[PDB]
Amino acid sequence: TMMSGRPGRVPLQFLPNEARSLPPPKLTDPRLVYMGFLGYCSGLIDNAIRRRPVVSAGLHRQLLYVTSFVFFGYYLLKRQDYMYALRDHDMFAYVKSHPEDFPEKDKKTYGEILEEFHPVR
Amino acid sequence: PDSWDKDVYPEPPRRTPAPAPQTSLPNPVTYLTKIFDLLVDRPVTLAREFIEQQHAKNRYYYYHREFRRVPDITECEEKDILCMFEAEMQWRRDYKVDQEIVNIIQERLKACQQREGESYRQNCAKELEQFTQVSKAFQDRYSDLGAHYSARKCLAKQKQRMLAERKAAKEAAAA
Ligand SMILES: CCCCCCCCCCCCCCCCCC(=O)OC[C@H](COP(=O)([O-])OCC(O)COP(=O)([O-])OC[C@@H](COC(=O)CCCCCCCCCCCCCCCCC)OC(=O)CCCCCCCCCCCCCCCCC)OC(=O)CCCCCCCCCCCCCCCCC
Ligand SMILES: CCCCCCCCCCCCCCCCC[C@@H](O)O[C@H](CO[C@H](O)CCCCCCCCCCCCCCC)COP(=O)(O)OCC[N+](C)(C)C
C-alpha cells in the first residue's frame, strides 16, 4: 500500500545501498540479545522434545541455534532501522514541500487562554 | 526556649501569682514538689548535660534548602512541556507552603483556646479572625480542585473568579 511503490526502489534488495549511511546496530543491542535468547529457547525446546537432557544435551547445536538467531536478527534490525529512517525522511520532506498544509500557529500563553473550570464537589 | 521563633508562635507575658497562704498548715503540694525535683529532675539534668557536652565534642550543620523563583504557569506557552513542568513543580511547592501556613495559624488558635481558660470566647478573637482570613484565602485558591489538581486548574478557577468579580464590579458601577 503506502510504501509498496516508491521511486528508485530495487525489487528484492532487502538492503539498499543508501542504508549504509546509517549507524549499524551495536552487537550488544538488547534486541539482538533477545534474538539470542530466542535461539537458546529453541535449543532447549529441541532438547526437551527429543527426550534429551534439556540443559546439557547438545552444546554445538544449541550454539548453532543461538548464532543463527543472532545472525538473522542483525540484518532484520538493520532493515527495520532503514525503513523507519525512510519513513521519517519522507514525512519531513513532505512537510517541508507543503508549507500551507502545516502552518505554524500563534504561540499563546496560559495567562491569555481561557479554560473553563469544572469544580470537583 | 530559643529553639523556635517567638514572633511566629507568640505567647502572652505569662503572669503568675505569688503564694499567699491564709493557714500555717503544711502544704502537701510544695513538699511533694521538692521530693519530685530532688528525686527526678536533678538526675535528668545531669544526664542531659552529659549528653549535651558529648554533643559539643562533635558538631555539624545541616542547611535549609533554597529554591529559585522560576516562571509560573501564566508565562508558559500552550504546549511548552519544560516550562509547564517547572511551573507545576513550583506551584506544588507553594501549595505545600500554604498548607503549612494554615497549620501554623491553626496551632496558634488551639494554643489560644487552651491557654485562655474560661475566657477563650472573648480573648481569642484575634486568632479566630486570623484563621478566618487564612482559611478564606486558602479556600479561594485550592478548594474544589479535586484529585488530579494542577496549576492549570487553579489558574482556570482564578480566572473564573476574576471574571465574575469584574462583571459584578462593572454592574455595580452602572448605578
Ligand atoms: C519474562 C522473563 C523471562 C520469561 C520467558 C519465558 C519463560 C522462559 C523461557 C521458556 C522456554 C525455555 C525452556 C523451554 C523448554 C524446557 C522444557 C522443559 O520441560 O524443561 C525441563 C528441564 C528439566 O528437565 P531435565 O533436567 O532434563 O530432567 C527432568 C525431566 O526432563 C522431566 O521431564 P518430564 O517429562 O517429567 O516433564 C513433564 C512436565 C514438563 O512440562 C514442562 O516442563 C512445561 C514446558 C514449558 C512450556 C514452554 C513453552 C514455550 C515457552 C513459553 C513461556 C510463556 C511465558 C509467558 C507467561 C505465560 C506462561 C505460560 O509436564 C508436566 O508435568 C505437566 C504440567 C502441566 C503444567 C502446565 C504449564 C506448562 C506451561 C508453562 C510455561 C511457562 C514458562 C516455563 C519456563 C521453564 C519451564 C521448564 O528444565 C530445565 O532444566 C531448563 C530450565 C531453564 C534452564 C536455564 C539454565 C541456564 C543456566 C543458569 C544460569 C543463568 C545464567 C548464568 C550466568 C550468570 C553468571 C554467573
Ligand atoms: C513469528 C514471526 C514469523 C516470521 C516468519 C519467518 C521468519 C524468517 C523470514 C525469512 C527471511 C528471508 C526472507 C527474504 C530475505 C531476502 C529476500 C528479499 O528480497 O526480501 C525483500 C524484503 O524482505 C522481506 O520482504 C521481509 C522479510 C522479513 C520477515 C521478518 C518480519 C517479521 C514480522 C514482525 C514479527 C517479529 C519477528 C522477529 C524475528 C523472529 C523483498 O522485498 P520486496 O520485493 O519489496 O517485497 C515484496 C512484498 N511486499 C512489498 C508487499 C512486502
Cβ separation of B74 and A110 shorter than 8 Å?
A: yes
| Residues of chain A with C-beta less than 8 angstroms from the C-beta of B74 | 109-111
Distance, in Å, from the CA atom of B136 to the CA atom of B42, rounded to the nearest integer, reads 49
Q: With contact defined as beta carbons under 8 Å apart, do B125 and A102 qualify?
A: no
For atom 36 of ligand 2, which residue has the closest CA?
Answer: A76
The answer as to whether A94 is a domain residue is yes
Q: With contact defined as beta carbons under 8 Å apart, do B90 and B108 qualify?
A: no
The answer as to whether A115 is a domain residue is no
The answer as to whether A47 is a domain residue is yes
Å between B107 CA and nearest CA of chain A: 28
The answer as to whether A103 is a domain residue is no
Phi-psi label, residue B148: left if phi above 0, alpha if psi -120 to 50, beta otherwise: left
For atom 11 of ligand 2, which residue has the closest CA?
Answer: A72
The answer as to whether A106 is a domain residue is no
Distance, in Å, from the CA atom of B161 to the CA atom of B158, rounded to the nearest integer, reads 5
**SS3 state at B170:** helix
Inter-CA distances, A73 with A24, A103, B31, Å: 12, 41, 92
Cβ separation of A109 and B75 shorter than 8 Å?
A: yes
State how many domains chain A has: 1
Q: With contact defined as beta carbons under 8 Å apart, do A25 and A78 qualify?
A: yes
Residue A74 CA to ligand 1 center (angstroms) comes to: 27
**SS3 state at B77:** strand
Return the C-alpha cell found at B66.
533554597
Host domain of residue A52 = 1-98
Identify the DSSP state of B38.
Answer: I
Distance, in Å, from the CA atom of B167 to the CA atom of B33, rounded to the nearest integer, reads 68
Task: Report the b/e string of B79-112 with b at 16+ CB within 10 A.
Answer: ebeebbebbbebbeeebeeeeeeeeebeebbeeb
Length of chain A: 121
The answer as to whether A112 is a domain residue is no
Q: Tell me the resolution in Å.
A: 2.8
The answer as to whether A71 is a domain residue is yes
* Beta-carbon contacts of residue A121 (< 8 Å; ≥ 6 apart): B144, B146
The answer as to whether A24 is a domain residue is yes
* Beta-carbon contacts of residue B153 (< 8 Å; ≥ 6 apart): A117, B145
Distance, in Å, from the CA atom of A65 to the CA atom of A74, rounded to the nearest integer, reads 14
